[PDB]
Amino acid sequence: ATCKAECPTWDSVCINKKPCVACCKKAKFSDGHCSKILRRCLCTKEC
Hints:
Elements: E1 3-6, H1 17-26, E2 31-34, E3 41-45
Antiparallel strand pairs: 1-3, 2-3
């Protein structure tokens, strides 16, 4: 009951959570969290 997918329009280092959450929101995801590795925007949502 948890789905994760990095923001489609995301291929750069995340500086702040807001940018990521912004993408995730427009992508129809509950919330986005920046990864620790490549710092990708991981969007998480219900499923």
